[PDB]
Amino acid sequence: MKFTVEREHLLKPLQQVSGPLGGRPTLPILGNLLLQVADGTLSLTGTDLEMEMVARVALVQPHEPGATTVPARKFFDICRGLPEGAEIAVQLEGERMLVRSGRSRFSLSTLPAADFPNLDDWQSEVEFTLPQATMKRLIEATQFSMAHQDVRYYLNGMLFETEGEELRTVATDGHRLAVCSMPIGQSLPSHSVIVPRKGVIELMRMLDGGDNPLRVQIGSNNIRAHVGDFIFTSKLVDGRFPDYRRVLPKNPDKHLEAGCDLLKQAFARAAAASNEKFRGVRLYVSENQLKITANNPEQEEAEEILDVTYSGAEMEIGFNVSYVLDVLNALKCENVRMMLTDSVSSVQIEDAASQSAAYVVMPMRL
Amino acid sequence: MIRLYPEQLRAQLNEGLRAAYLLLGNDPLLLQESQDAVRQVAAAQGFEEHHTFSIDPNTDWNAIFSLCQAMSLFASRQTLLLLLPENGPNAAINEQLLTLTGLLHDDLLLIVRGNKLSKAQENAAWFTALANRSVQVTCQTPEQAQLPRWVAARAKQLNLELDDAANQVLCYCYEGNLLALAQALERLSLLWPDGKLTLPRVEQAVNDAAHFTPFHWVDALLMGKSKRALHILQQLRLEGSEPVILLRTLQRELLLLVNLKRQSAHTPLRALFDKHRVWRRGMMGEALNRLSQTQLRQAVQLLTRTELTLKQDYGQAELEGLSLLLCH
Numbered sequence: 303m304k305f306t307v308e309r310e311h312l313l314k315p316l317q318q319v320s321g322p323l324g325g326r327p328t329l330p331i332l333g334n335l336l337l338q339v340a341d342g343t344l345s346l347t348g349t350d351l352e353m354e355m356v357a358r359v360a361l362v363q364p365h366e367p368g369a370t371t372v373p374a375r376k377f378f379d380i381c382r383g384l385p386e387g388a389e390i391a392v393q394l395e396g397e398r399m400l401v402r403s404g405r406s407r408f409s410l411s412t413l414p415a416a417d418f419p420n421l422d423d424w425q426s427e428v429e430f431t432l433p434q435a436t437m438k439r440l441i442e443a444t445q446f447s448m449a450h451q452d453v454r455y456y457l458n459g460m461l462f463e464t465e466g467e468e469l470r471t472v473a474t475d476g477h478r479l480a481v482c483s484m485p486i487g488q489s490l491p492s493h494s495v496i497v498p499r500k501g502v503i504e505l506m507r508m509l510d511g512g513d514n515p516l517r518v519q520i521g522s523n524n525i526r527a528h529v530g531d532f533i534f535t536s537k538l539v540d541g542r543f544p545d546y547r548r549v550l551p552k553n554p555d556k557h558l559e560a561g562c563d564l565l566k567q568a569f570a571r572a573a574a575a576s577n578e579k580f581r582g583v584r585l586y587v588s589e590n591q592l593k594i595t596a597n598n599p600e601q602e603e604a605e606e607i608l609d610v611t612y613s614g615a616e617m618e619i620g621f622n623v624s625y626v627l628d629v630l631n632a633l634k635c636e637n638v639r640m641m642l643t644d645s646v647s648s649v650q651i652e653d654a655a656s657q658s659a660a661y662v663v664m665p666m667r668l
Numbered sequence: 669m670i671r672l673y674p675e676q677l678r679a680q681l682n683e684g685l686r687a688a689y690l691l692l693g694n695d696p697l698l699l700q701e702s703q704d705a706v707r708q709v710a711a712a713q714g715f716e717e718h719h720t721f722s723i724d725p726n727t728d729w730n731a732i733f734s735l736c737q738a739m740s741l742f743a744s745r746q747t748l749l750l751l752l753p754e755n756g757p758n759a760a761i762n763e764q765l766l767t768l769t770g771l772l773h774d775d776l777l778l779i780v781r782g783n784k785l786s787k788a789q790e791n792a793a794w795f796t797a798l799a800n801r802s803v804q805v806t807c808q809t810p811e812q813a814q815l816p817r818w819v820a821a822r823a824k825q826l827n828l829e830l831d832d833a834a835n836q837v838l839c840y841c842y843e844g845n846l847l848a849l850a851q852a853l854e855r856l857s858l859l860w861p862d863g864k865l866t867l868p869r870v871e872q873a874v875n876d877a878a879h880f881t882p883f884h885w886v887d888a889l890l891m892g893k894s895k896r897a898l899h900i901l902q903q904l905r906l907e908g909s910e911p912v913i914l915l916r917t918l919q920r921e922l923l924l925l926v927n928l929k930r931q932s933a934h935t936p937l938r939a940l941f942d943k944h945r946v947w948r949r950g951m952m953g954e955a956l957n958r959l960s961q962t963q964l965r966q967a968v969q970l971l972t973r974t975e976l977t978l979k980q981d982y983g984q985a986e987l988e989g990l991s992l993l994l995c996h
Contacts, residue, residue, distance in 0.1 A: 453718045476717060476741045549741055580733035622734060648741060664739040667773065 303339050303368015304393035305361045309403070312390060313382055315357035318532050319348040320374040322355065322504045334371045336418045337392070337399075347420060348374060353501050353536035354421050355508075363389070369415035372399040380408055421535060427521040428493055432469065432486040434509045434516050434529070440471045440482050441506050443659045446628045447480035448473035448499070456541035460502050462520070463494035472546045478625045480632070481546050482659040495520055496543055501536030508532050549662055551650045556614030556642035558587055559654055565594075565638060566630050568606050572596035573623045575604060582666045583623050587642070588616040597668060619645040620668035626651070629661045670803045674698050675821075677705050677805050685710060686803045688769075688778040692785060693807030696908045697846035702805045703779055707747050710777055717746035724753050729764045736771040745775035752782030756789055765794035772798075784808075809846060809908055815839050819849055826853060829863055834870035841874050844910030848881070855879075881909070886918045890925075890948075890955040894995040901991055911987060915975040918990070922968055928952060929961045959994065967993050 320335060327333030327350075336347035342365055346357040377399070381390055384403045391402040399410035441460070449457035452475060460473045467490065470483035497505065505527055509516065514530035526535035572583050576596035584597035590612045595605030597620055619642065629651045630638060639654040645665060652660040672680055691702045707718060717740060721732055735748065757765060772778055785795070810818045816839050823830040830838075830853075842848040856865050856873050874880055881904060888897030904914065924944060931940050941947050967990060974986040 454716060474741065476744065477738050479741055544742060580730045580737065582734065582737065620737070622738065646739065662741065664741050666734075666739060667737040 303337065303370055304364070304366040304391070305339050305344050306363045306365075306389055306391040307344070307359065307361060309381055309384055309386060309388050309390060311359055311362075313378075315346055315359055315531065316378050316381060318508065319346040319355045319357045320378055321507060322353070322500065323348050323350050323374060330373075331371065331413055331417055331419070333374055334413060334418070335374045335377060336369070336371055336415055336420065338369045338415070339365050339367055347418070349418075349420065350500075351419060351421075352498070353504055353534065355504070356533045356535075358531050358533070368394050370394045370399060371413045371415045371418055372410045373412075376410055421524065421537070424522050424524050426519045428464070428491060429517065429519040430464070430486055430488045430490055431515050431517045432484075434511055434514075436484050436486070437469070437516050437518070438506070438509045440469060440484050441502060441509075443482035443632055444471050444473040444480035445502065445506070446473075446632065447475065447478055447661075448502070449475035450499070452476070454541075456496055456539055456543045459496050459498035459539045461494060461496050461543045462525075463492070464490045464520075465492040466490075472543075474544060474546075476544075477622070478629075478661070478663045479544075479546065479549055480629075480659070480661050484658065493520055494543070495525060496539035496541070497525060497536060498539050501525075504534055504536065508534055549648060550660070551641055551643055551648050551662065554641040554643045554650065556587065556612070556617065557640065558592070558610050558612045558642070559637060559639045560592065560608055560610040562630055562633060562635050562638045562653075564608055565592075566627065568592070568594040568608060569621075569623055569626055569630075571606055573627075576623070579623075583621045583626065584618055584668065585621055586616070586618040587612050587614075589613075599668075614642070617642065617645050618668065619649070620666040621663070622666050625663045629663065632659070632661070669799045672803060672805050674702055674805060674807060677702050677803075678709070680803060681705060681709050685713065685777060686801065687772055688780065688798045688802040690785075690798075690802060690804045691779060691781045691807055692783065692804060693809075694783055694908075695807050695809035695846055696906065697850060698807035698809070699781055702807055703749060703781060706777070706779060707749075710745075710747060714743075714745040714775070715747050715777060716742070716744035718749070719746070720749040720751065722751040722753075723757075723761055723765075725758075727761075727764070729767075732764075733768065733771060736768065736773065736776055740775070743775075745777070747777050747779065749779045749781065752780065754783070756782065756786035757792055757794070762789075762792040762794060765792070766797065769794040769797040809844060811844070815843065818846075819853075822850065823853060823865070826857060827863065828853065828857060828865055830865045831867055831870075834865055834867040837867065837870045837874065841880060841913065842909070843913060845908045847907045848909065880917075882914045882917045885914060886921050887951065889918065889991065889994040890921070890951040892954065892958060892995045894992060897991050897995075898988060901987060912975065912978060914987065915971050919968075919971050919975065922964070922971065925952065925955050925959075926961070926964055926968060929956050929964055932956065963994075 332350060338345045339361065342361055344359045344361050348355050380401065384406060388403045393400045397412065399412050401408045444460060448460050452458055457475055460471050462471050467486055467488060468483050469486045470481065472481040474480065508527065508529050512530060517528045519526050523538050524535060525538060526533060569583055572594055573596065576598065578598065581597045581599055584595050586593040590610060592608040592610045593605055596603065633653045635653040635655055637654040639652055641650040648662050648664050650660060650662050670680055689706050691699050693699060719735060721727060816835055819835050819838060820830065838849055838852060842852060852873065856869060860869060885897060885900045885904060888900060928940065937953060941949065946952060970993060971990055
């Protein structure tokens, strides 16, 4: 094989295909890219046998058939470490990858492309499109709530589901939960899949406000995202993922509406005021009043009050500072509404202004 | 407190989960089995959340504590496994533990894994705090005499017909490493649904099959594979395998390389190679090749001695010597 093209139409592609991967791969084949040329198109392919990115580049200058597997780290630095504007001529020499940037020519050790483990294709089962930014926010709004290394492996990934003409993701470590729903623009059937950590990360990556409204195809045990030239694909996690509806507080009496940043303060302040961080925050809601004090079990120190809109009995509930703060941050709003019940049962924070997203945080042992 | 033995846990674990479990011992298989018996029985009682922490000089104790004070979104109870440092509960560690032995509520079982608690360390604050409100499992590696029956037993509870002789064999080559003996049996088991592990099959299992791990190490030596060789040497003891074995095998391969070396031109590479039933070529061929006889004897002198110390210097590194020695 042989092809030649600028250092621009290559670095970007060569950066996205090997972007997620990169390290001390297992077998040498896993840390290698797949270079192919045919019909006047060079196709780069990277994979970690969980997901795989594939860039498509139409070879303008002289091209020629062939399939080789050159290393990734190496092959990228080289082209990335050359005169910006220089052309690169690659040709498969029996068992080496001859490169040429002017006369700055290299030679890479290469394994057969007949050994590459490309996610042997499978059958698509839904598909639809929707602006990146939308498919973006859906992630941002729930990503922080996905477990990290939980033995309940299904939690280590976000869920995606479509029903109606609404796409909604939901993440959860079994202490706090996050949910966001968005309008795609197409009436789609109803299916629900679990995209994993890395996969969500990658999917989040490629997204960047590009004139290529992401196209999505959910399926058997795979899901892919064709965004212009890049085509990210991830396998799915399998297991019963908790029902976001069975956790939402059921008929909560107590309701309160405060200030998004005013509460950030409250909690943030009390957070620092808490020298023994494992004790968490202590909220005391009383008829239109919020005395938020850093829970110091064996102590009574300084706290803060807030002039909020409350209803229901008075109660003091414990809260893991963080869980509450992530929620307030995710809610880039002004006024936050809340729904309580019990000092030992789930709470539902959420923006007042809208209902696109909703969070639920389990209080902590006071 | 209840002092128990691995083959008693499942019982005094069925009657009712205690609040904390102390898995104390030097054997790695037994520790892992017991903590599984526990989290298993437990997991079948609402305990669907688990967390493991290593207690060293970096333990972010906050997270551990905050964890205890947490409430599940799916009301699932939780397990917390704590991995003590090699030596035992440190002086500062005795503090944090104490704090935690106090945060032990109910939807929170607790397991502590380590070696026999430093003789007077069972006086520490935290310990006595749990002492009657807990269970203690003693996971010690059985040894020489006691190893056979441990295997004889294990076999039986697998419904296998291990022979008296074959039991001893397995004991001789994996001696000290429970995980190896276990997985060994698991394996022969599948190779013969017949169920009868006769001497021949054990032998065939140890011989013919190259899953006699030290052979992987002795392998790295020939190939002068130091780095990846040390790795194997490491794992080889994170399985509980006793060194008195690695020597005897190499102390042969090596002895051969001497017989081989003493004949580079006495009878050469495929001539004498097609004699001693080793023909590895690239290996024995790399050894004798890249390695000399001035080096060879040092290695034989060394190993010879290393295996004379633990017998005539009993009680208390001399293997990384050989490792790095056969190379550089």
